[PDB]
Symmetry: C2
Subunit: 583 residues, 2 copies
């Protein structure tokens, strides 16, 4: 259902705070959800659990963990319907109401919930256990594989993506209420015809006893259009368009109305009116060419891992404005909903991406014993959930289906083909892409024609023609010539950068130095400006972030333009110089 | 009123989130709370606003700021009373409901609230504006003075303390409900007769029609004792005590009961049965001698300033447990209430401290034109609000009235005298202290005898000009001798350490190196261990933190044993060695 909010007809209780916490063990205490959890450990809830406790065993845990607390259902919610929702459980979440299992959810970055109305009475207290598993298989969405170390028998988790596999309840948890007759979902699609905006709306409600009313109210509070019935099309004369650096949001009020025109339910949905179209080599927002600038990001901060953080979000956006970035990509999984809402308000453009990284074992990637049909089912599901949650965001401008898949290999085409079709059928208003890895050159890639925009990740400077920028430059523009020659589509570089340690400086060409980072980005830009077909540049990455451990990762990925704590490297100042002065 | 909770009779709504934010300005919008703020800025609400926006004007701003958002009172609060509460607005907060002022509060680190029951009806939406001011004066409890830079006209805030003057709503904001008859306060006081535990309670409730019941439930869910009446003494045979090693917490449920046997209001107060006592030079918890190990801390993290953060809190306590630290002090303001609850559960011991730092201009500090009796009122007020909120925490084992006052100057004894009497009077169950500065030597100080425990801050700087260890050692020992000859009280060292940059190393004796910090702590310990009267050692500081700009401050205070982002310097390992053993 829709993201809960408080209305005149709905109440909303945060369940954030400290919960009791335990790992699964191998004792008789199988089934921790059947009684009061016995632990001194408390884990804060919007957070990944891994780095919270300064304990290796928790950090390295493979398998299930348990969060628990008591909840009291407000006494005045008899006569109403009520749910427990996890905005996200990374990767597999189970909800229990006193020992009854009431939801079982497999994706790691989208919402799930359970209607507990008939299990617990208003004003009753219950024990809420939420079990979350972190295990990845070749069928989970980021896929991976658990192994056992021979000598010690320690379980270990392998996977093919960079960022660390933080787990837990990294986003907030809620108790909320709706009326018996309630709104469940709303879809809004926005076109523009001259100066007139139009909203195609569709409301889905638990009942059609009593009817649906809509009002559309502008930023000044004046009702600018009205409509009746669950589905319809509204015109808005002289619209204020939502624009890439000037957000404008109307506010769509969907209500359920009884025989007496008495409101029995209501929901307020923020709406930006704007259009995305791809025309040849151009990416058009409101019929005008747009050029992405900004980053691929990560949900990653010092202690709470991937947990949502209001402050770092608002700061992160301020830093985007400060350097004149107009966009980012939700690199390698959907971010928290609040980020998308905030982007809507900040006038920031978003490439919104599924959790589908790691579909590459370079052993044939797309085969029965690796990334097969059952993985595609999970991928299809990821696509549906992402789209079902983020479809109404004006800031969301395109769907990214995957990141660095092995789109050069046999089987890749048979695997991906249905997916861009599924997306476009779920949401026909946005174009679809994926992020292409170096191995799938314009010659070798077998999947690119099935997409509306091409996104490329490239590290010519760093990984291959190492510190040889003149060699990287030639190879970069060879590759881009190939792509422009072969496809009539917009090109966005979604990765390009260099690991860089704050304070490490050199007047020579030296990788891992701030000078090198600047020089490489600056070369890439020179090359970008040589190609009419370029529609965007998003540096990798906004900020240093944590990775699986490895002799080649210096306490994480240090390709950030800011440090993990958001201090700017020289690179940051270079981008600021370029993005505040370019078109 | 008591820290609000959700019960069967009470509802609690978090108002944290992003709020509209504006700086005050000198335009005809002289009153932003009378209408929707159309600013595009949004500030997150458990946070200080200063480093959040990446904006100078906002960071350096002196004066009021406005937070704003709409709220809806739930439909079902009809028969109910409801309030808006700020846990804290630093330093001066105002709450507005649609153009109307309904609360005005002055301290920066304790809660305030307003009964809005009669202004807004159940199911109504209203505009909530909260004004927060950051100006310090000579009468604000951390005192200060606003000044004008002559060449630029720029407004600037002076003060005498280290930590940066972060402001805003650094703590959570709430809408909550309470029945017409409700409990408003509870005092518990715990003591021991043999193996039987004693709980004196007093419950203050809005009306006396229909009685009060108390149940005391143990960690297994067993009701272990009951009582009737608004106040009384409950006996807990074979009590499990709250100990520094090992928290045990009973759960006391105070209720109001109607004519029938029907619960009208209820409230769940965690209580740990424990005594604190000073005897000669010994600090006793449950009759056995106690030695404080741990830190002076601060509420300081990278972006959110002093904003409370559950993650950093849990981690910071794991690091304490990791290095075997058993205590910390709330230098230099009461910390979030949730930290004190968490301290109760973690078995960690707390010296709880007021905002009264910076009462020192080293011109005469204690005089009619400086820190005066009007200031003393704010100070008394600060003691009152702190003790009222933290009185029931078993973790809180001592009140610290001030940090680094000029306790050596004329006027200082006459200013301070009322204050420890006031504290002991509002809480007779704990001892009172203050953290003494290096100027106020055993000779010079004229306040110390008025307190129950002596806490010394003795950075080596007080003792040596050129970072010479043997020089520092001789002077620290001389001074500690003075204190132990002249007072029969426990001594706790509450500040010692060295500015230290992570990664700066030297095989020599070099200040600002990880080695120097190690050697200095270690030398201090050797000196402390020579003195029986020592009851404690808390290093300054737990972690690196932000300060006002000073060419002597390297983007803040680097005396942390951890970095701002909680990485250990060598000193952390050295402390871990000492505290995990003896
Ligand atoms: C690592 C990935 C998957 C790709 O994404 C990465 O982004 C960031 C990073 O690189 O640091 C991090 O977020 C994280 O590490 C990853 O998600 C970046 C590109 C990537 C490293 C590829 C290459 O850079 C180049 C490769 C070449 C291709 C080719 C044709 C050649 O240049 O000659 C063959 C040799 C080689 C090394 C084969 C591997 C890839 C395709 C490589 C290393 C794969 C992984 C990519």
């Amino acid at each position: 259902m829709l993201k809960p909010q408080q209305t005149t007809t709905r109440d909303l209780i945060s369940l954030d705070g400290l919960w009791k916490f335990a790992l699964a063990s191998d004792d008789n205490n199988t089934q921790p959800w059947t009684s009061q959890l016995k632990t001194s450990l408390e884990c804060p809830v919007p957070a990944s659990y891994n780095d919270i406790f300064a304990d290796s065993k928790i950090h390295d845990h493979v398998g299930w963990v348990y969060y628990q607390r008591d909840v009291i259902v407000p006494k005045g919610w008899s006569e109403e319907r009520y749910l427990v929702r996890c905005e996200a459980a990374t990767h597999h979440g189970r909800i229990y109401v006193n020992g009854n299992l009431v939801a079982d959810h497999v994706g790691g970055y989208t919402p799930f919930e359970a209607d507990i109305t008939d299990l617990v009475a208003a004003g009753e207290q219950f024990r809420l256990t939420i079990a979350v598993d972190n295990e990845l298989t070749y069928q989970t969405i980021p896929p991976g594989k658990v192994e056992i170390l021979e000598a010690t028998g320690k379980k270990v988790q392998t996977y093919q993506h960079d960022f660390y596999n933080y787990a837990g309840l990294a986003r907030s948890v809620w108790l909320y209420s709706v009326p018996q007759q309630h709104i469940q979902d709303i879809t809004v699609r926005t076109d523009v015809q001259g100066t007139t905006g139009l909203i195609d709306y569709n409301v889905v409600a638990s009942t059609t006893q009593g009817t649906i009313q809509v009002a559309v109210i502008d930023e000044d509070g004046t009702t600018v259009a009205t409509s009746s019935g669950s589905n319809g099309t509204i015109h808005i004369p002289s619209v204020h368009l939502w624009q890439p650096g000037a957000a404008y949001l109307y506010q769509l009020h969907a209500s359920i109305i009884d025989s007496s025109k008495k409101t029995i339910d209501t929901y307020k949905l923020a709406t930006g009116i704007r259009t995305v179209k791809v025309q040849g080599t151009q990416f058009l927002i409101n019929d005008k060419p747009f050029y992405f600038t900004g980053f691929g990001k990560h949900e990653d901060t010092n202690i709470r891992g991937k947990g949502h953080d209001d402050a770092y979000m608002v700061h992160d956006f301020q830093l985007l404005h400060w350097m004149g970035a107009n966009s980012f990509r939700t690199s390698h999984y959907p971010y928290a909903e609040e980020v998308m809402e905030y982007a809507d308000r900040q006038g920031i453009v978003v490439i919104d991406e599924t959790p589908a990284v790691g579909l590459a074992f370079s052993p044939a990637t797309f085969s029965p014993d690796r990334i097969n049909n059952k993985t595609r089912e999970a991928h299809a599901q990821a696509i549906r959930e992402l789209i079902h949650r983020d479809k109404n965001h004006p800031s969301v401008v395109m769907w990214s289906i995957a990141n660095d898949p092995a789109s050069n290999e046999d089987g890749a085409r048979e695997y991906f083909a249905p997916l861009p079709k599924l997306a476009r059928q779920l949401d026909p208003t946005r174009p679809v892409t994926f992020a292409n890895v170096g191995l799938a050159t314009y010659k070798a890639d077998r999947i690119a024609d099935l997409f509306d925009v091409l996104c490329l990740n490239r590290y010519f400077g760093w990984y291959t023609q190492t510190a040889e920028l003149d060699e990287a430059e030639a190879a970069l523009e060879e590759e881009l010539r190939g792509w422009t020659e072969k496809y009539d589509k917009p090109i966005v570089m979604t990765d390009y950068g260099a690991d860089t340690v704050a304070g490490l400086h050199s007047v020579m060409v030296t990788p891992w130095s701030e000078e090198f980072q600047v020089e490489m980005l600056d070369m890439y830009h020179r090359v970008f400006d040589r190609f009419e077909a370029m529609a965007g540049e998003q540096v990798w990455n906004f900020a240093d972030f944590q990775t699986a451990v490895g002799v080649s990762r210096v306490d994480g990925n240090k390709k950030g333009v800011f440090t993990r704590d958001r201090k700017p490297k020289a690179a940051a100042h270079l981008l600021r110089k370029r993005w505040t002065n370019l078109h």
